[PDB]
Chain A
Amino acid sequence: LTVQSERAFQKQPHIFNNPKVKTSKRTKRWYKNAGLGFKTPKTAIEGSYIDKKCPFTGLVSIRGKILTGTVVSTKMHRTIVIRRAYLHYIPKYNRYEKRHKNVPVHVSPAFRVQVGDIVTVGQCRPISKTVRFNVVKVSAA
C-alpha cells in the first residue's frame, strides 16, 4: 500500500537517516521484541508500514492479562472484534448457562487476519475510547 497516504509525513520518531553518508542500503528501521516468548514476525523487520501502535515497531508495551478469542468482525481500519465464550454456574439449580463478551482489539499490519481465526491478544495502555488490547499471535484455524 501507499505509505505516504496522509496529510502529514509518516516516520518513526528520532530515527535519523543521514543523507551525508548515503550508504547503498535499506532505510534504517527500529524494532524490538515484546518478550514473554512472542516471536517478532519477519514482515515487521522487513516491511515498510508505519504504525505507532504496533507492539514491535511502535511506542506501545505489553503487560497484564493475555487472552484468546475468535475473530467476528474485520470491518474497521486496523481493528477487529473477538468473541469470548464461557459457562456461568448457578448454585440453586446446580447447573450452567452459556454467556459471551465482545472485545475490540488493535491489529498491526504485520498480521493477516480473517473471520474465524483464533487469536492471542495482550493488554496495553488505553489507545482509544474502547480498545485496550493488541494482537500478538495468530493461528489460522
Chain B
Amino acid sequence: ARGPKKHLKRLAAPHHWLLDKLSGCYAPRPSAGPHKLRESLPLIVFLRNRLKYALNGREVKAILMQRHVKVDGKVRTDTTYPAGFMDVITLDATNENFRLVYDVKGRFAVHRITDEEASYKLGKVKKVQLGKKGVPYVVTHDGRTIRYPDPNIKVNDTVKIDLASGKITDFIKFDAGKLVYVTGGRNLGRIGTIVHKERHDGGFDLVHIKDSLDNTFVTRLNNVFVIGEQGKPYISLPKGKGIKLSIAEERDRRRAQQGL
C-alpha cells in the first residue's frame, strides 16, 4: 500500500460486534479517536444493531444530524465515532443514559444508569510526566491529559473525572484487596479482588485475581482495571456481577428456572 487504508471488509471486523455474514460486503470502519480500533464500538452499531431505533445507515444519520446524541456530554455527529469502555452516552429525548461496560461473555452490554451517575467516568492512569515549563500531567486510557495531578498519583492507579470541567475529584491506589475489572484476553469481563502481583523485570507483570466464588485466575497487568474497594464499586455493575459459570450450570438455570 502507498498510504492509509479507508475500508474494512466484513469477516475482518471485530467478532464481538456480532455482525451477520451475509447482509453485505463491508463493515463500518471506525474513525480515529479516543479508543483503539480493535476495541471500540462505532455509534452506527450501537443505534442500529443494539437498540433497534434505526433500520438503516441512512436513518442513523438523520438522528445524529438533529443533535440528539452526545457522548461524554458533547454532541457528536460522525456516524463512525469510536465510543469505548466506560464512556457515557446520553439520549435526551426518551431521557436515557447508558454506560458502555462488558458482559461476562465479553460483549458490550446495554446497561442503563441513573441521571445522577451520568455525571462522571473512571479513568486508568497510563503515564505521568513533566510538561513544558515544568508543569506535571497525567494521561488516561481514553487519551485525556489533566494538568496538576495530586503528587501521590502513580501509574496503574484509577482516577475519577467530572465530565463537566474535566477535573479530577478522587483516586484509588493499585493495591492488594482492591476490586478489579478485566478488560482483555481470555478472561474479559470477569470481576474479582487482587491477591498479589508478580514482578518480572524486562517482561510482563502478572496479577492473581480471586472472585467471590473463590475461583482464581491470572492475567497480564495490562488488562487490569481498578474499580473500587472490596464490595464497594464506584460504578453500578451490570447484571450478573461478572461471575463466570460453567456451561453445565448455564443449561440448568435456563431450562429449570426460566424455562419453567
Contacts and interface: CB of A to CB of B under 8 A. Distances in A.
Contacts of B116: none
Contacts of A36: 201-202
A137 B189 CA distance: 44
Contacts of B202: 36, 63
A36 B201 CA distance: 7
Interface string A26-41: 0000000001100000
Interface in B170-227: 201-202
Interface string A46-84: 000000000000000001000000000000000000000
Contacts of B201: 35-36
A96 B202 CA distance: 32
A59 B202 CA distance: 20
Interface in B218-256: none
A63 B203 CA distance: 10
Nearest to B201: A36
A123 to B, nearest CB: 11
Nearest to A66: B202
A36 B199 CA distance: 13
Contacts of A35: 201
A67 to B, nearest CB: 14
Interface in A1-46: 35-36
A63 B201 CA distance: 11
B162 to A, nearest CB: 40
A72 B201 CA distance: 31
A35 B201 CA distance: 10
Nearest to B202: A36
A130 to B, nearest CB: 25
Contacts of A63: 202
B199 to A, nearest CB: 13
Nearest to A37: B201
B202 to A, nearest CB: 6
A36 B202 CA distance: 8
Interface in B37-75: none
B206 to A, nearest CB: 18
A73 B201 CA distance: 32
Interface of A: 35-36, 63
4 contacts: A35-B201, A36-B201, A36-B202, A63-B202
Can you list the 4 inter-chain pairs with the closest CB atoms, starting with the nearest? A36-B202, A36-B201, A63-B202, A35-B201
